[PDB]
Structure formats: structure tokens, C-alpha cells
Amino acid sequence: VPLMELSGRAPVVRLHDIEADMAAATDAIRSQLTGWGFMAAEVPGIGERVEAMMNEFAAACRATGPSLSDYAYDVVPQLAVGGTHGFFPYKEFIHVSGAMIGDQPGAGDVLRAFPAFGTRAAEVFDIAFRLISLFGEVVRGMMPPGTPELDLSHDATNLRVIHYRAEHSGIQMLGLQLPPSDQGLQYVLHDGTWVEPVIAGTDVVLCNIGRMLTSASDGRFRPSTHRVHTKRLSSVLFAYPQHKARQWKMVDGELMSLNATWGDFID
Ligand SMILES: [Cl-]
Ligand SMILES: [Fe+3]
Numbered sequence: 048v049p050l051m052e053l054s055g056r057a058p059v060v061r062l063h064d065i066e067a068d069m070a071a072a073t074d075a076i077r078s079q080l081t082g083w084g085f086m087a088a089e090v091p092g093i094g095e096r097v098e099a100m101m102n103e104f105a106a107a108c109r110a111t112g113p114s115l116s117d118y119a120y121d122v123v124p125q126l127a128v129g130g131t132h133g134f135f136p137y138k139e140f141i142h143v144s145g146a147m148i149g150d151q152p153g154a155g156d157v158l159r160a161f162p163a164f165g166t167r168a169a170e171v172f173d174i175a176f177r178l179i180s181l182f183g184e185v186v187r188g189m190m191p192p193g194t195p196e197l198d199l200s201h202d203a204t205n206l207r208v209i210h211y212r213a214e215h216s217g218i219q220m221l222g223l224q225l226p227p228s229d230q231g232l233q234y235v236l237h238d239g240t241w242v243e244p245v246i247a248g249t250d251v252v253l254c255n256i257g258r259m260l261t262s263a264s265d266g267r268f269r270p271s272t273h274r275v276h277t278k279r280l281s282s283v284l285f286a287y288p289q290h291k292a293r294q295w296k297m298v299d300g301e302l303m304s305l306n307a308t309w310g311d312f313i314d
Contacts, residue, residue: 100167118157138211216270224257
């Protein structure tokens with residue numbers, strides 16, 4: 048599987064100029080989606096924050112003062128409508144939702160229990176959510192006129208951090224792969240062959256098309272199917288619209304509102 052270098056070739060998006068740098072990167076990003084099936088940007092300083100976050104998660108995974116399993120999903124208060132946040136014991140991982148970051152009450156306790164990790168996770172969540180919303184505006188701009196805004200929801204979006212890790216794609220609208228600790232993540236190209244982005248220990252983030260966006264675009268953009276081939280930590284933002292909101296679909300240039308909700312799509 049060929050390596051794909053991205054450091055130094057992907058568009059640069061600076062942490063304190065995100066909106067302006069993403070506007071400049073728009074054409075490069077569109078050409079990635081058209082030419083590869085996934086997108087990429089280099090964000091100077093992101094790797095520093097993500098590695099710190101991941102290493103603090105690894106330490107928390109071994110801790111007992113309070114243990115992360117004290118915040119396993121089945122003992123964390125969950126939203127009446129939405130996905131499941133909290134810790135998933137053993138390959139062991141945590142979902143930090145936007146709702147959890149705002150304590151929606153007690154859901155925030157895992158971040159109060161591990162505040163060094165939790166502060167980094169909130170920081171990375173916020174950067175990732177700003178970036179991914181601008182990626183969605185790029186993709187929207189490629190879609191026919193009258194395409195609605197993606198309407199990604201802060202509270203329904205979640206940052207997953209994994210501790211010990213076949214081909215698949217995300218169910219949601221978009222994903223943002225942050226630089227993992229090790230190489231091994233691979234993506235399939237439009238020609239059906241696989242590539243391995245060089246991203247471990249870099250400032251490069253990848254943006255994945257999820258299956259909700261494949262549906263909303265009526266097949267125009269296939270999911271950014273990927274797999275992990277190892278020879279070990281990783282984090283990714285999964286961006287969702289509001290679960291109770293009505294699906295829509297651009298069919299042959301016409302906007303269609305459906306009865307089914309985005310929550311129905313997940314089920
Ligand atoms: Cl995924
Ligand atoms: Fe994935």
C-alpha cells in the first residue's frame with residue numbers, strides 16, 4: 048500500500064485564522080474530494096495538542112483514584128434523544144459529546160474527574176468542530192444550488208479518543224481524523240486501490256464523508272471508506288446534525304424534504 052505524503056502539500060490552515068485560511072483552501076479541498084474521495088489540511092500546532100490529549104487519555108486508562116470505568120456509558124446520564132457518550136471499557140475508548148462538555152447534568156463529571164485530559168479534549172473538540180463545519184461548507188458549495196446548510200449540531204457531535212486501536216465508513220455527516228500516534232490508517236481511492244496517508248505525529252487532519260452526507264447528496268459523494276492495518280492511540284470527531292431534524296436529499300437538482308429524521312437514519 049503506497050504511502051501518501053501530505054505534510055507540506057496539503058493546504059495550511061492556521062489556528063487563529065481558521066475561517067480565512069479555509070476560504071483560501073476551498074479550491075484545493077474541493078479537488079481533494081473530487082480526486083481522492085477524502086480531504087486534508089495541515090493545521091500547525093494541532094499535533095502538539097492531540098498528542099498531549101491522547102497521552103493523558105492513556106494515563107487515565109490506567110488510573111484508579113477515580114477510574115475511567117466510573118464513567119462508563121451505562122452509569123453516565125444520557126440525553127433522552129441522541130447517541131451514547133462516556134467511556135466504553137474493553138479497544139477501550141471514550142465519546143466526549145458536545146453535550147457532555149456543557150454538562151448535559153452530571154455528564155460532565157468524567158471531565159471533572161480527569162481535568163487535564165478533559166481540558167485538552169474540550170480544546171481539541173472546539174478546534175475540530177470549527178474546522179469540520181467549514182469542511183461542510185466546502186462540500187455544500189460543490190452541491191447544486193439551493194442545497195441547505197448541513198446544520199451540524201454541537202451537542203450531537205462527539206470526539207472519540209481510542210486506546211488500543213476492517214473497512215468501514217462513518218454513519219454521520221462528516222468525520223475529522225486527527226493525527227494518530229502510529230501509522231496504519233488507510234483509505235480507498237476512487238479507482239478502488241488503497242493508500243496510507245502519512246499522518247502519525249504530523250499536523251495533518253483528514254476530513255471523511257459520512258453516510259448521512261452520501262444520502263443527502265444522493266450518491267454524489269461516496270463515504271470516505273477507510274481501514275486500520277497495524278504492524279497505539281487515535282482520535283476522531285464524528286459530526287452529526289440534530290437527531291430530531293428532518294432528512295433532506297438533493298435529487299437531480301431538486302431539494303426534497305423527507306418525513307424521516309436523522310435519528311431515523313441511524314436506526
Ligand atoms: Cl468512521
Ligand atoms: Fe473510522
